[PDB]
Design a protein around this ligand. Structure first.
Ligand code: CL
Lengths: 289, 290
């Protein structure tokens, strides 16, 4: 079908030992972004060391084919972080054209599951974004910059919506407000009010910031769980550099500092100071409470 | 000063030959985000090959010090892309504690300039995101998902304000709507209409999409200029793979497919097909028009 139709394109890839799998996805309608506005999209997953992610475009007779070539480690990370909703669809709905080591058979199976570790990491990442948007919106609002405050407050609600979906054990999709209308009615209502309430712009932002601050408190443990679990893997305090250098925390580096600060203030993390023997300098240390 | 007060901390860094500069920034207020809620932030720029970007936290006597260790190429990129507003602030307002090869003195000067190539790249990146948010917004509206469409429409408008600011030759800031109030009143007014709208949710979104589609077409050349210039560096069409592999387009890889699709529909890029001799396969090829 698609296997026959694209054989002259994909066969060379199948032949290269590093290829782990080939999936084909047929357009759903014309101008499908799913298939790059082409007729068929081929996803070739490889261990080729020279590859991260690239794209090739072909036409075979009348069939226009877009080929996405992606390292197995790139795709894995996208999946783990839920950073590519298209890729998820490709794998789950796509047709297996070729595989080694049952790579795609197993991948489809794994996609029906949401490992806790992945979910919790994703919650920390969302929480971190919510916290930053909230803070910026708050600060901007204080300074009477209402149009710019509205922007951050708005983005904050969106991350909160996403977090609320994660909290209920589901992956956030592009249609998140519909997800959260049930997964979390309180969050939905805040958004509805910011958008449609009869109040003034200044008042709408104020009211949104109050609701946000409150929900932000409510969800602190959700935002921190992954971090705390990593930190407890050792029976003693961490230096900031140690946290920053920890592989399990690599995706959080950008936000670690702000998160740790917030968690200290909430009494979830303990800050101390350890002076080096023979020296004057102290290292700031952090420990989960 | 800060030099004297942090000497015990930074000295070992100044000694490492790969270190290009050390900047000190003092807190402006308590719990200053600028300095990581510490008293002094030290920024160490280094060519240490093991370094991308990392942070260390110290207390020296009573003084709490955050140390940001960043590779020169990581910083450069941040500055090229305008991806880190704090860093711009650090380098520009910061006190030079140490440097090699006038690295920091020159950097401070360079920061007063907005190179054309960097501006144009930023404009393509902004335009790329505007285009994607607009498309999602339109799609979600078509499907009756209004709360979600609003989300994308709003984001698209935010990208449009940033683009409009770049167009006038300035770096977008955190207070972009303020900047846009004068840099592009038409964009500002479209946003204002959306916020202060008394229409139905559906209607206000629909009106915002109309306005967006218009302004998008209007700024098409701002968005495509960097891409077109790179493309015209050769006198024949490009395959998609060739475009994807071109180093100058690295930052645009994620959006190149959509940008190209868009530019084809606006008549700025020409799509053709070249069949490989002896084979049935054709490579799709792209060329800027005019
Ligand atoms: Cl001892």
């Amino acid at each position: 079908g698609m296997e026959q139709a694209t054989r002259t394109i994909y066969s060379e890839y199948a032949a290269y030992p590093e290829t782990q799998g080939i999936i084909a996805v047929e357009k759903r309608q014309p101008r499908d972004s799913l298939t790059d506005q082409f007729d068929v999209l081929l996803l070739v997953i490889t261990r080729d060391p020279s590859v991260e992610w690239t794209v090739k475009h072909y036409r075979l007779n009348t069939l226009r084919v877009s080929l996405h070539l992606v390292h197995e480690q790139v795709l894995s990370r996208w999946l783990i972080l839920n950073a590519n909703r298209r890729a998820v669809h490709w794998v789950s709905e796509g047709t297996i054209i070729f595989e080694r080591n049952d790579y795609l058979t197993d991948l489809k199976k794994q996609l029906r599951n949401f490992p806790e570790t992945e979910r919790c990491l994703q919650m920390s990442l969302s929480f971190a974004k919510l916290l930053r948007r909230f803070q910026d919106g708050r600060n901007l609002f204080s300074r009477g910059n209402y149009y710019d405050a509205y922007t951050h407050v708005h983005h904050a609600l969106h991350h909160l919506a996403r977090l609320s979906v994660l909290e209920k054990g589901a992956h956030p999709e592009v249609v998140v407000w519909e997800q959260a209308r049930l997964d979390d009615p309180d969050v939905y209502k805040l958004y509805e009010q910011l958008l449609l309430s009869e109040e003034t712009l200044e008042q709408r932002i104020h009211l949104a910031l109050i609701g946000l601050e409150h929900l932000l408190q409510s969800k602190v443990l959700s935002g921190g769980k992954y971090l705390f679990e990593v930190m407890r893997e050792r029976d003693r305090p961490w230096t900031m550099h140690e946290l920053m250098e920890e592989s399990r925390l690599t995706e959080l580096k950008v936000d670690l500092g702000s998160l740790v600060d917030f968690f200290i203030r909430k009494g979830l993390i303990r800050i101390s100071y350890q002076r080096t023997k023979g020296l004057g300098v102290e290292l700031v240390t952090y420990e989960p409470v």
